[PDB]
Structure formats: structure tokens, C-alpha cells
Amino acid sequence: DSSVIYRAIVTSKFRTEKMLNFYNSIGSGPDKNTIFITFGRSEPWSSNENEVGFAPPYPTDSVLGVTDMWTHMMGTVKVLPSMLDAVIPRRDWGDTRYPDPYTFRINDIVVCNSAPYNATESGAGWLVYRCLDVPDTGMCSIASLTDKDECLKLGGKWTPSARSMTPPEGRGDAEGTIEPGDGYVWEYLFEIPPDVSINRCTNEYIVVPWPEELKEDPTRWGYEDNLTWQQDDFGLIYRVKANTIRFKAYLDSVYFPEAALPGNKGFRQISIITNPLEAKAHPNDPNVKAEKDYYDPEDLMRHSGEMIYMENRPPIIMAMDQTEEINILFTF
């Protein structure tokens, strides 16, 4: 083939913006989408449900698959923007329950300061660091090569063969070097207040703030001090390359009118629909867009709004305890 050829790749930063686009898209007024979570499907399918494996009916996106859904919907909850949050993969420094506790690739964000085996500063904060460099020893990445720098040119991912003693101790970029001792040049990036970490962060993911909550104070997030050639560089959601978002809601918040049915027989399939219209008595009424807080699905028009996601799952009967949690973590 002889022709002009161009080699192009979308940057990862495109994703985080797209993520930032789904957030802010939640609001009351028009042009702001409103998402609902739906459960429903009270009646059991087959008899092999409640057994092991066996799979559910695989859900389809056709019109027939939507119609029945609206007939079985037991209840719904409206997602408010507050209960949605950004998230990133968390690597706790020097934790033995996750791979490579003492070793780190060229750039990997790693939280420290939480749990005793990493100490660094006190006054909590759950400090986080990007790690800009590594000791040079040990064979790494493509083919053989030998040395770090040559392995850093020609692409490559260099894994240090020397355990990194002690966590990153400082508040500012490139905390390594400056002493005969080893370690490598971690770079502070923000902080996580203790109050949010007990709620908003699970052990799989650590929250990173929306470029909003960083306003109405930065300090709570330990971002109060920064180089910032720009007046702000305010949103750091780009700095981490945060690729994903996470939802959380308590099942006490979802609204079941019947209130004895979801408990006795589980909701077998969950789907999330967008922009439902309110109940219209007859096609004599103008189209209104759904607001307030609960919506017994009787008050939702059938096929009223489009549905981005369907799940089919075995019965997942729910206890009425005031804590059980939805997750539904989006990867945008």
C-alpha cells in the first residue's frame, strides 16, 4: 500500500473530560439529564433460579424487552449529584495484600499514611504521591536491553529491582534525592480528609475531588498549597488521569410502595433509565420532565425515557437493614 498514512490516537485526557461531562449533566432544568435506578422483576423466572450458576435470561435491548420491564418495575430511586463521586485505583504503600507492595512502576499514584505500616505525617490526610522515577536495576519490559535510560527510550516500562524503603515523607514535588539514601522522587498530589475516607472511599478505590468541592475551600483536601503557574489549575481531576466514577446509595433510599414485596421476593433485574416523563392521564397533556424525589413507577409514563443499562441477576433478596449499598461503578 502506497498512500499518505497518518497515525493518530485519542489521548487519555479525553476520557476524564467525558467523565466530567456525565457529571454536571445532572440537574433540575432542561438540557440537564436525570438518571433513575430501577429494580422490579418480582416474579421469579424458571425454577432453576435460586440454584448455583444457571444464568439468567440474557436481557435484550429491543422494544419487547423494554415493555415487560415497565410492567414488573417494583420501585425506583432518583440519583442526586451529591451521591456520585470520582474514583481512581488505590495502591496502598507497603500493603502486603496487593501486588508489588515495595516496588513501583515509573508513574503510579500510591496513597500512603493510612494504616500503621505506613506512617509519614500525622494528623491523618491519606497522602498521595505520583512517583516520578525508580532505582535502576533489574531487567524490565521489552526484550532484554539492560540499563534504565535506554529502556526508557524506545518505550518500555522499567520495574525497579530494589525495594523502596520508607514512604514518601514530604509535602512537595520530587521528595526524593537530596541525600545519599535511596528512594525515588515521589510527587505529592493533594490529600484525603479523614472524614470523607470513612464514607466515600472503599478499599478498592480512593476518591479524587470534583473541581467544585475543591472550591468552597481547597484546604480540606490538602491542596491549599501548590506551585500553580496558573491562577488555579484548580481541577486536579485531570492531574491523576481519573478515568472512572463511582455511585453509592442506600437501599433504604429507593422507594418501594408495596414495601412487603421487595423483601419477600427479590428484585431480579436492575436497569437505569434517563429522562422519564411524569404520569399523563391521557394524551391530552403537555410533556413534562420528571422532578422531585421518589416516583412510584406508576407515575412514570411507559417507555417514557431511554434506558442506558440493563442487568439481569439471580434474586438478590434484600434485608431491611438501613445499610446495604448499590455500587454501580462507571468506567467512562
Next chain:
Amino acid sequence: MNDSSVIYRAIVTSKFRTEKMLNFYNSIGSGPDKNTIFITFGRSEPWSSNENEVGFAPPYPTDSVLGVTDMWTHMMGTVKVLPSMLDAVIPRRDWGDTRYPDPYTFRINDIVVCNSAPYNATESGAGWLVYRCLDVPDTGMCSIASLTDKDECLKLGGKWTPSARSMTPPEGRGDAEGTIEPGDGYVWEYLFEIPPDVSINRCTNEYIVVPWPEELKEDPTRWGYEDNLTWQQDDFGLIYRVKANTIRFKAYLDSVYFPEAALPGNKGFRQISIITNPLEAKAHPNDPNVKAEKDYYDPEDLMRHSGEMIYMENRPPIIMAMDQTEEINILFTF
């Protein structure tokens, strides 16, 4: 995880691919919150010894800042992409053209255009009417992809090549509610209107434009609604029903806006990016800062590395001689 006791099934459907796209365009607007877009132009360096030729290609860019930084070094000028220029598209299949491989056929769910041309022209006061798609293939004669055959195997299997031609594929605006079925089989489902003005402008040899909601909901009868009772079913808007799921924006690079650069010999070597929400020179560094609203900013005044780079590309020569405008088409599925 793997092979868990419980096994669940999740479609993610189509619409999420489209609805996510809508949120992208739904804020391009003017203000602090609306994060406008800017395309950008390229490198002056011969880029290699073998530069102009067919074989070989620019080196693959890198997402790392080490590659982000060289653009603002090697870049000249940024055209702006207005909200009006970006557009959502569809492959534009049309019946009757001999140039494209299969003249009619158009199996099961496919988008057609007619009345666009010599061969397909009918009933034209409306220009292109035709974004309507096929509801059902015609009766039998479908020999489909595997062994089995009959009007059955679409369900357990693939798609039908009906083997019979279609005739009179033009159609009225449509039947009340559900739509027309003029000939043998080949039921047709009428999909919007597409007036002629937007056609000759914002369509192309490939693809086609679909309106966004907030236009049609604003104005029926230009794009031609109120025939559709299924409209009041789910508000106006319909970018979903078309299953658009793709977005492209374009930019006009006119050598007049960049009179420097455009001299006898400019070689415009590769690099043509995209970006978001840049900022002004700021004069002396201490100051407030402003969102950048003015077209064709020069590379200087942009606060080197302001905003975040959302795209990258390398096209080895281009040309960019004076008086020859440049039209860049870039197509995303987001």
C-alpha cells in the same frame, strides 16, 4: 470476579453510547462552564530525511507530557470549532447508485437516502426526505449466512440478503403512526426530514447530518415533524432513534488568518491536534485569567500548555499554500 457463583448479564444497550455523546455537545456553549473546543495546526520541521513519499509514516505520537510539550513548541495557530460546526453522522446508504457496490437490497435495518440524485429523485419539493429505514425484508428468497433458510433464521442467526430487487423505493411522508409499505415487503419506517439547505452544506460524499434535540423540540416543520404521533411519546429529540452514536467536527483553516506561516515554502509537517478551554497571554503573569473566545489565536498568547490536549494526529506533509483553505474532518464515536 471470574467464574463466580452468581452470573449476571448486562447489555449497556446502544443509547448510552449516544446519550453520552449528547452530553458532550450539550455544553459547548459560551461561558465559564461550557468548555469550548479548539483545533490546532502543525510542525515546520522536515520531520525526517525521507519525508515526502507514500511508504513510511510519522512516528506514533505519545500521550505523555513529553509529547504534549512538543506540540506547543512546534504548533502554529489554532482555528476554533464553533458549536454549530460539529455534527453527528450516519454512513449514508442510498438505493439506486451504481457506483457503490450493491444497488438496492439493503438488508433489514439500514438507513437509505434518495431524492438526492438523478437516479433516485422523486416527489422533490422537499429535497432529501429519505433517512427512513427498512422495517422488514421482503417475504422470502433470503439465503442467510448459514445453512438454514426461511423466514425463521433471522431469530437464531444473522441477516437476510433478500435476493430480490426493490422498486418504487420512494415513499410518502408516511402512514399515520406506523409507516408505509409500498412494494413487495421492504416495509419502510420514515425517519425525519433533512431540508435541502443543510444538505448541500453539512452533508458530504460520505455520511450525513442528524439534528440534535433542542432544535427539533424547538422547531418542528423545518425538519418537518407533527406528522409523528410517536413524537409526543418521548418528547421531541430523536438522535437516539437514529442510533447516531458518532460525532465529527470540522474546521476551516484559511491561510488568510495565518498570513505568517503561509509564505512561498511552508511545509506544514504533521501535527494537527485538538484541545480544550485555552487561555489568553495574561500580559504580565500576575493577573486574573479569561476563557479564550476569539478565533484563530496565534500560538503565542495561549499560555503555553493551557487547557488539556484531547486528541493527536500526524499527517506527514500536507501543503497549506496561501489562498487554499483547509478543511479538517475528524470523526469520533463518543
Next chain:
Amino acid sequence: SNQYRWINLGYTANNSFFFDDADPLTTYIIRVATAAQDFEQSDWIYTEEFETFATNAYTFQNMIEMQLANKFIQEKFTLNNSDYVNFNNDTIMAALMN
């Protein structure tokens, strides 16, 4: 892929269809796939290259008073030649054997 051809045996709405023919000491290599209305076909899966046996076998139950002619066994069952006597078709008969 230089061989095997393939032979479609049809489709089924439940797992585990029962197959016939397959002349002895030949065939082998079954393969299956799944499909639906809205989904693209999955990938084929092969089973452990089996092989058919020499003749056939049966163990049948009936009254202890009744006995079976060895031809009716050999023709219809252990050699699997149908149409010998098809109880769905033929008229049979009965005689009193003094």
C-alpha cells in the same frame, strides 16, 4: 481447515440434543455454538475427538414371560437398521402357537 467440511445438524432450544447416523468408527469432533435474535454468533467449541464403537448395544426390559427373536434384536437394535419393522408403520400380527 483443509478437511472436516462441516455438517449442520440443526438447532435446539434446549441443551443436549441426541444425534443419530454417524456410521461406526468414523465421524467424531462435534462442535457447538450459541446464537440468539439480537446477538452475534459466538465462537465454536470442540469436544475431545471421540470415536464411535463397533456395533451397538441395548439392555431392554419387558415381561419375563415374553421372549424376543434374535433377528428382531440384530436387525432393528444392535445393527440399528430401522424400517425392518417400524411399529409406527407396519400392521404386525399375532398367532397362537399350539
